[PDB]
Amino acid sequence: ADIYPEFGTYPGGGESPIIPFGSEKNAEREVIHGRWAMLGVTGAWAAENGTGIPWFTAGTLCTPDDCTAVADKFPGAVAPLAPEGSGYPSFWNVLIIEIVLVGAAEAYRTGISDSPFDDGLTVGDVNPGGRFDPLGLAESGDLEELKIKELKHCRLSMFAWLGCIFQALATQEGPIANWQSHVADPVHSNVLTNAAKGFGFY
Amino acid sequence: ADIYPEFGTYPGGGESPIIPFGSEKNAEREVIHGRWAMLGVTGAWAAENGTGIPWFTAGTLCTPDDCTAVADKFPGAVAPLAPEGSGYPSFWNVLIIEIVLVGAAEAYRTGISDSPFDDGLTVGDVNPGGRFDPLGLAESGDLEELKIKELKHCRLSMFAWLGCIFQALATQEGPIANWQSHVADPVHSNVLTNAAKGFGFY
Amino acid sequence: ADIYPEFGTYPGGGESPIIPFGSEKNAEREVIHGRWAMLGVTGAWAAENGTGIPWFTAGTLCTPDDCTAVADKFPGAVAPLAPEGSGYPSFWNVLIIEIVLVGAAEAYRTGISDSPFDDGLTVGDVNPGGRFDPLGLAESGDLEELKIKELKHCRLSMFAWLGCIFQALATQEGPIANWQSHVADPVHSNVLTNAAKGFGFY
Numbered sequence A, B, C: 001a002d003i004y005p006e007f008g009t010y011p012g013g014g015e016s017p018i019i020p021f022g023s024e025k026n027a028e029r030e031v032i033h034g035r036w037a038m039l040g041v042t043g044a045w046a047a048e049n050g051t052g053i054p055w056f057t058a059g060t061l062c063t064p065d066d067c068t069a070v071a072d073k074f075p076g077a078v079a080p081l082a083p084e085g086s087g088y089p090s091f092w093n094v095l096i097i098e099i100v101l102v103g104a105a106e107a108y109r110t111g112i113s114d115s116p117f118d119d120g121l122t123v124g125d126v127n128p129g130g131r132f133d134p135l136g137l138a139e140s141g142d143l144e145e146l147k148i149k150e151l152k153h154c155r156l157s158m159f160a161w162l163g164c165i166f167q168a169l170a171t172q173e174g175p176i177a178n179w180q181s182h183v184a185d186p187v188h189s190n191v192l193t194n195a196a197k198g199f200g201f202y
Ligand code: CHL
Pocket: A055, A056, A057, A058, A059, A060, A062, A063, A094, A095, A098, C018, C191, C192, C193, C195, C196, C197
C-alpha cells in the first residue's frame, strides 16, 4: 500500500496474489536466490560491455584443455592474470579454489559446519547484520525500508535473469546486443518481429 | 455425479482431484480464461476456414509498415474494410482503438474504474446478469445447470487451445489442416507418425 | 534420520522439504509411478544392451503396416516370435491383447471393476500383500524397512527416467550410448561439452 503499492506484497505484509505463502522457509529462499540473481545480471551485463562475450558462452574460455584465454580479458588490467606462456590460469586450480571457498562459505551460512566466529549470528536469518553490515547502514537508516528495497531489487533481478535465459534461447545473441538492437529501431527489432522470423528455427 | 459425472468436479461441488481448490478467486479466473479460450478457438477455427491463414501467423498481416492486407479477407463482405490505395486500415489506429475500448471494458469489470451504470452490479461476480443477460436466459431456464454447461465449455475450449499451441509447434500447419490430414487417413496421420518423422526437427 | 538420512523424508516420516505433503492420495500415486519407472528404466537399459535400439525409437518397429521386425529381436531365443513370412506379430493383435489385459488389471486394481478374488484385498492399498507377496518376503523380513527400500528405488528410478527423457532430447542417442561415451572419456564427453556443441541445434 504505502511502501509496496506494486502488484503483490512482501512476507509479513499480506496475502500472496496467486501462489499461496505457506512456508516461511521460502522467504529465506527468495532472498538468497535474489542476491545471486543480482550478481548474475550485473555480471553478465558488465562482462558483455567489457569483452563482448555473452554470458551463456563464457564457460568455453576455461576448460581443463585450456584456461589461458581469460588471462587478458579484464578491461584496464595493468597485467594479465598470469604471464604469457605459463599455462595459467589452470582450470583445476580454479575449480579446487572455488569448491573450497564457496563450499566453506555455504556450509557456514547454512549450519552444515559450525561458525568460525563467536558472535552468535543466527543460522537461517537472511538479514544477520553485525560483521555483515560493516558500514552500519541498517542501524543508521530504516531497517524495514531497506529490507523492502532489497526485496524489490531481488525480484526485479530474478525476472531480468529469466528474460536473459529466454532471450539467449530465442535470439542466440548477448543481452546487451538485444538491448542495442531494440533501442536502435524498437518498432522493427523486438520479440514479435523475431517471432515473425521464426526465432531461428521456424 | 448427477450433473458432473465426468472426471473432477466444479467449485462448490466437492474436492479437486489433483490440484487443491484453496482460493475462491481461482474460480473467477477459470471462468474468465475460459470465455476468452472459447472466443479464441472459434476464432482460429473460423478464420482458417475462411481465409486459409493459420491463427499463429495472422499477426504478420497487420504491422506499422502495412495493414492493408487484412482489408479484403472477410468472406462475403460487400466491400473491403477500406478503399484500395487509401493506406487503411492503419496499424496505429487499430492499436489505439483496441487499447481504449478493451482497457476501459477490463477496468470497468475489475473495479479499476467505477462503473458507468448505476445498476449495482457486483465487481468480482463473473455471472452478473442484468444487462449482461439481455435475453433473460438465466431467469427463463435453470441458472445452475446453465452455469455448469458454461464451465464445461470453458474447460473444453481451454484444453483445445493447449492442443492448438502444441500442434502448431509440432506440425507448423494450421489446426484445420491437422484435422483434414487426420480424417483423410487417421492411421497414417497422427502424433505418433509425426513423432516418427521427428516433428520437423529430429 | 536412522532409516532415511538422505535429503527429504517419507510419507508418515516428517515434513516435505519443498512441495508440501497435503493429500494422502499422492503417496499412492508416488508408489505406482515408481513401480512403472523401475520397469521402464530397466527395460530401456536391457533392450539397448540386447538389440542396440534406443527406447525412444523402438515403437517404429511395430505399426499396422508392419510388426514383423520385432519377431527376431529377443537375444538367445530358440525361435522367432512367429514364423518367417507368416506376417506375424500383427499390430492389431498386440494392441487388442494389451488393451484387454492391462485394462482389466488396472480396473481390478482401482476399483472400477469388482475383484475376481474373494480375499478381501483393499482397493487403494499399494502394499496389499497376500497373493501379491507369494514368496512371503513381507512377513519374513521387516515390512517397514522393505517399504522404505521400495520407496527409495521408486524415486531413484523416476529421476533416472527424467534423465533418459532429456538425454534423448539433448543427444539423439541411446542412454547406454551416453553412458559408454561418458565412461570412455568423462572430461570430454558430458552435458557441458555437449552444450558447447549446441545440443545439435545451436
Ligand atoms: C551458477 C552456476 C552455473 C550456471 C547456471 C552455469 C550455466 C552454464 N554454463 Mg557454466 N554455469 C555455472 C557454473 C559454472 N560453469 C563452469 C564451467 C562451464 C563450462 C566449461 C561450460 C559451461 C557452460 C554453461 C552453459 C550451458 C549449460 C547447459 O547445459 O545449459 C542447459 C540448461 C538450461 C538451459 C537450463 C537448465 C535448468 C534446469 C535443468 C534446472 C532448474 C531447476 C530449478 C533450480 C528448480 C526447479 C523447481 C523444483 C521444485 C523442480 C550455461 C549457460 C557451457 C557453455 O558455455 O556452453 C556454451 C560450457 O561449455 N560452464 C564453471 C567452472 C568454473 C562453473 C563453476 O561455478
